[PDB]
Subunit: 238 residues, 2 copies
């Protein structure tokens, strides 16, 4: 007579089905190659946004094979923060839920000052703020590794890997948010931000992208279930 929490979270489709773990309050797909997530999916409602982040010491999720885990020593002295894809601030409903965002499977190496602690946090705060006035909200977040044109006229994907376990440092991060403003009607916002120092004055809407750019770059199918006729607003328009 009640849904599974994971069916509630994944109502609008799985971005992909690779190495999926269902936690107490979010769903994650893990990439054995990069040692960080392919994507995480979250479902917020006002009531669920109404515990501690302090009783939270990051650790590996050991239900993945040991040879494919990342560890604290990979992030230590690397210059990068442990950046949680499913934000701790989105899960205030029990200590277990929030603790689970501190699994290293939910972490990616992120620029600290100028990004994770700042602009990227502003994006996370923006989604909670909007979710509070919405009925249901669905958020997909993940790392990107994007090509750049180099001086030989060729395109290359280049990214750092850190630690003995070679954890990938994403070039960018995506976040797509689906907001249910009235029953069966949705606003859609898609963003791609660079994993780099972002000038604090830059508005988040500058990082708006077509949803197709996220999908094509990520190799994922986002909100596949959804009917395009149900979207009343995209990236702030219409």
């Amino acid at each position: 007579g009640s849904p599974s929490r994971s069916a509630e979270i994944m109502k609008h489709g799985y971005p992909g089905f690779t190495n999926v773990r269902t936690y107490e309050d979010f769903v994650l797909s893990y990439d054995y190659k990069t040692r960080t997530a392919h994507w995480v999916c979250e479902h917020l409602t006002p009531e669920r946004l109404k515990v501690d982040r302090k009783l939270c010491e990051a650790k590996p999720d050991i239900t993945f094979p040991q040879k494919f885990l990342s560890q604290n020593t990979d992030y230590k002295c690397s210059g990068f923060d442990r950046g949680a894809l499913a934000a701790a601030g989105n899960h205030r409903k029990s200590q277990l839920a929030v603790d689970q965002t501190f699994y290293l499977s939910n972490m990616s190496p992120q620029v600290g000052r100028g990004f994770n602690r700042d602009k990227w946090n502003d994006l996370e705060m923006h989604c909670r703020r909007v979710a509070k006035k919405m009925i249901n909200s669905y958020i997909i977040t993940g790392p990107l590794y994007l090509p750049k044109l180099e001086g030989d006229g060729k395109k290359y994907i280049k990214y750092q890997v850190i630690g003995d376990n070679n954890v990938a440092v994403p070039t960018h991060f995506f976040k797509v948010a689906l907001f249910e403003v009235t029953p069966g009607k949705f606003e859609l916002e898609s963003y791609i931000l660079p994993n780099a120092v972002i000038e604090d004055t830059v508005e988040i809407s500058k990082f708006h992208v077509p949803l197709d750019a996220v999908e094509r770059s990520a190799g994922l199918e986002i909100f596949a279930r959804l009917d395009p006729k149900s979207i009343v607003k995209e990236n702030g328009a219409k």
Copy 2:
């Protein structure tokens, strides 16, 4: 009557991963939407499967996209055309000799990776493929798993970076390396294992393929896969030429 269906036969020793699985007539493939090439392919050979059926030829085969994957994740001939790289088949055409359809399917672009031509695809990597077929003729069953790798390199700032070119309008990944893992059943339930990693680069003809031996664990860590992961370790009598 009980003789196994083809897919179950090929995958007897397990799926190395479960992502975007495509079962063809005579090989199984896992496709990577991100890189626009395979995660891995798996093949099964026997001495009888390595005898050419008359009238089957690579002559009438041409490369073509597998249009059963979503359009935004397809690679196209035009991505490879004039790119500086060959369409390198992971599941090799030469391993598939019993039917025209079987070999036609190795020409799907899902089974192709951009490979350096002279001194690799056409030379040293082909030497490895020939080796595996040579050994396979002497074995009861032979299982081969082949895939691309994207491996880091130390740079001047002392940090490690993965760097690879992406080609064409669809940004198909050019792997830095390729792995091949072969499991040869020498006597019933008794297996020899051979693992290799070669760079996607010009390799001198005089280098023996054995120089590219690497531990199976090395392959799995780099590939992010679990290869021949249901084997009883007792069943393995030889690894990379030793035991």
